[PDB]
Write a structure and sequence with these properties.
The structure is cut from a larger assembly and holds 18 copies of chain A (about 25 residues) and two copies of chain B.
Chain A: H1 2-21
Chain B: H1 8-17, E1 20-25, E2 31-37
Antiparallel strand pairs in B: 1-2
The chains are: A mainly alpha (about 25), B alpha+beta (about 40).
């Protein structure tokens, strides 16, 4: 399930962007 | 160097011997020298 | 792996021996600890006193 | 397919966060 | 795998919006 | 019909954003 | 399926304009 | 195709709504 | 149908130009 | 010739946008 | 292909108008 | 155990949120 | 050793909180 | 179930910190 | 498992509490 | 397991101190 | 019991860090 | 006698905090 | 041991007194 | 029992200091 792992990584990256931006 | 807890001397020594050193944030939340990457680029 | 003050081979008097000391390490940004360990050279491949003898 | 439900929930949370931020 | 495609598209659109916001 | 699903999801996200904007 | 490319281009311009509007 | 025409008025109404919001 | 492709490319270029110009 | 209708729609939208801009 | 010539002329006039507007 | 790491990442995000708010 | 894992997790969360507080 | 118990500890610690923060 | 559903509910409640606390 | 009780006391004292500090 | 020694060292480090931080 | 070391650490943190309080 | 528990409430009361003085 | 005597004396000095502080 490479595609699911990539989706999870992308979600985590986007989530880190938004958490940093909310600072 | 005061910004992060890297211990740059060990980093330079490891790089000069040819390791692929990794630096990044750990469970503490402090930037430090994690383990070296092995084999693959 | 932290040095726990047991490895120190003390030379200070008895009343100066800390009961509990921990080495300052680069983890946690060196913000906790009691002592550090110094060495003459970062990488030690050559004997300095031999260089004096050679010249 | 619980993991898909989790992905949908996280994405919906991120979208709601950005929408409330925009307004 | 329509849910997979929908999730990927949502992630990509969110990425575009976040990148625009950062700049 | 992956492209159709992607277009549908993009449109849906668009009306979600604009509907939240109106409200 | 050139008309579908037409639809994708319309929707892409839509997201571009709305994203520029938001920021 | 009914799907194509439904997407047609969807995108057209979305564009008109964006223009009306811009005014 | 290379002529239609050229017309589509021209229209997409114009849309991008105007969208960039507006903001 | 619905693709030509799509091109006409795009060009018409561009012209209306520019006419509202100028006037 | 009269409609094709009309569309090409409209596109070209639009390009000239945008070129004048930007500079 | 994918859903488990998803839960872990959501709770990590909540921790990051609260830390950012506290500081 | 469940209590051991709980204590380790509490300590780690405390370290992260202090790291955020100091910097 | 070490991951489960440490996740429960994280959840409980976050609830406690939130209860402190709210009042 | 039931404990998984309890964890889901607790994380969702934490997210809601943080969101409405942020205001 | 009174030593574990001591560790719990220390961690609890730290958490109470930090919660009074933050809030 | 080297694990307990490590936990004790971590807690002592945290206490020293917070005590220094307060003043 | 690890619990006695625990007591010594608690008392040492106590003196450290109170000494920082005095000056 | 009675000595250990007596030292226990002694240190605990001392800590509570210091915290109350700090308030 | 030298360590016990040292701990007892440290505690006693601590309550002497804090009692004088309260008075």
């Amino acid at each position: 399930s490479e595609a699911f792992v990539q989706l999870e990584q992308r979600i985590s990256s986007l989530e880190q962007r938004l958490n940093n931006l909310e600072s | 160097q005061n910004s992060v807890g890297i211990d740059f001397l060990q980093l330079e020594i490891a790089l000069r011997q040819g390791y692929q050193v990794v630096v990044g944030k750990a469970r503490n939340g402090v930037i430090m020298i994690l383990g070296y990457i092995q084999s693959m680029y | 792996k932290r040095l726990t003050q047991d490895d120190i081979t003390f030379i200070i008097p008895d009343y100066l021996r800390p009961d509990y000391a921990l080495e300052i390490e680069y983890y946690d940004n060196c913000q906790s600890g009691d002592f550090i360990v110094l060495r003459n050279k970062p990488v030690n491949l050559n004997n300095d006193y031999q260089i004096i003898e050679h010249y």
